[PDB]
């Protein structure tokens, strides 16, 4: 499993600051062993793909489930591909809780993006009241199944364990809590899909990952990378990419 | 009131086909008396703005209510202005009924796009069941009010009456049914805002406008232009722009 690091710019940037950020990234010393993808605002996807080194992938932050049609405000996987992007982030928790995206919609988007040849970084994670109610497992397994039931080819899927309570709060999950969930997801994969899928699929961690935080998270056996929010907008992002060095 | 025509491309095109379409608009003979705006998919806004003649405006099909933050999949007015677009379409029936945007949310979005310097094409419209119930008026005054409560400067606002039953169905409102709502909205503005706002605000009609239909609807006294979907992707778009000629 190749170490995977995804930066999610979320709703941040202009061409001037995304330009600086990109310049830095292109000049940096990035492990040859980490696979890097940056998730840019839709408005900036083409600029990002044009400016970023080809060795770095570009992902869309969201998409809809059909190729064209009367959906004012949406973009499809066909348009994403047209600009040169290779990934889409689906199921992010902000899409789930701020915008009401249901597991059923998310599963339809995954199957569509996959049909169109995009790679998918699919997000799952419980809320704190769920953690504390002792149902983490139930919740993540329910969200994972909705995704899995819509995946025919795992070669282009990256699972992202994103506990809602850790996203932008500073409350990173300890390495032990990340490791506990990733191990159980990998276990789920093995029993519901296959050993072969369990072993090759990357399961990345997201939620308040920092240059300071990463080494320790990264040494966990079932952690294959990170999905970085706030820190992907900073030079330490380069430190996260090289977390295994 | 300067006649206004907005083309909403919705979720369609690639660089090649939008490029062709754009070339068509740049070389066509377009009425100097019509204000034209093309609403491009977010992923193509910068491309559109760069290839389109400066006389034709560019509009985003949607935006969020803050300049930046943790809103994966969203874009803000600051970004829209960064690439040179001057408008945004808000409250479109597809955003309202497919993506559940509420009146409160649409309102907050208007107030922000406006504080930020963009013009807003704001949509209102009843569903078939409301028309049949005879409540078209109650419904548009209510949606209208939700927009108005957030407008300080009406000079950068275009009201689009887009009955849902007319969107993409082929079922165009009749010249007399469009005229009757427009006159009602204009009087709404007159009693609730001011006579000057009423007099100066453009009220455009959306819903199955074709090269075929346009002349008779444009002849109605309170109909200031059109919001065009499906036909904005065709040559006939030029005829619509030129409806009063």
Curated annotation (Swiss-Prot), chains A, B:
Which UniProt key words apply to this protein?
Cytoplasm, Gluconeogenesis, Glycolysis, Isomerase, Lyase
Annotated binding of substrate, by residue = 8, 10
The Gene Ontology biological process terms listed for this entry are: canonical glycolysis; gluconeogenesis; glyceraldehyde-3-phosphate biosynthetic process; glycerol catabolic process; glycolytic process; methylglyoxal biosynthetic process
Its main subcellular localisation, reduced to a broad class, is cytoplasm
Q: List the catalytic activities from the record.
A: dihydroxyacetone phosphate = methylglyoxal + phosphate; D-glyceraldehyde 3-phosphate = dihydroxyacetone phosphate
Q: In which pathway does it act?
A: Carbohydrate degradation; glycolysis; D-glyceraldehyde 3-phosphate from glycerone phosphate: step 1/1; Carbohydrate biosynthesis; gluconeogenesis
One GO cellular component term of this record is: cytosol
UniProt keyword Cytoplasm present: yes
NCBIfam families linked? tim
| Subunit annotation | Homodimer.
Protein name in the entry: Triosephosphate isomerase
The protein's organism comes out as Gallus gallus (Chicken)
Gene behind the chain: TPI1
């Amino acid at each position: 499993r190749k170490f995977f690091v995804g930066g999610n710019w979320k709703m941040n940037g202009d061409k001037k600051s995304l330009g600086e950020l990109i310049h830095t990234l292109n000049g940096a010393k990035l492990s040859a062993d980490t696979e890097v993808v940056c998730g840019a605002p839709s408005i900036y996807l083409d600029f990002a793909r044009q400016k970023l080194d080809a060795k770095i992938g570009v992902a869309a932050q969201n998409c809809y489930k059909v190729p064209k049609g009367a959906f004012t405000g949406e973009i499809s996987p066909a348009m994403i591909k047209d600009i040169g992007a290779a990934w889409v982030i689906l199921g992010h928790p902000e899409r789930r809780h701020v915008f009401g995206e249901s597991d059923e919609l998310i599963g339809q988007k995954v199957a569509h993006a996959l049909a169109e040849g995009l790679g998918v970084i699919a997000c799952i994670g419980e809320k704190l009241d769920e953690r504390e109610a002792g149902i983490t497992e139930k919740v993540v397994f329910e969200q994972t199944k909705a995704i899995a039931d819509n995946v025919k080819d795992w070669s282009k899927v990256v699972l992202a364990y994103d506990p809602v309570w850790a996203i932008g709060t500073g409350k990173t999950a300890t390495p032990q809590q990340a490791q506990e969930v990733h191990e159980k997801l990998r276990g789920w994969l093995k029993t519901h899909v296959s050993d072969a899928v369990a072993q090759s699929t990357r399961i990345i961690y997201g939620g308040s990952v920092t240059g300071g935080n990463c080494k320790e998270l990264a040494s966990q056996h079932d952690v294959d990378g990170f999905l970085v929010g706030g820190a992907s907008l900073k030079p330490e992002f380069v430190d996260i990419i090289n977390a295994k060095h």
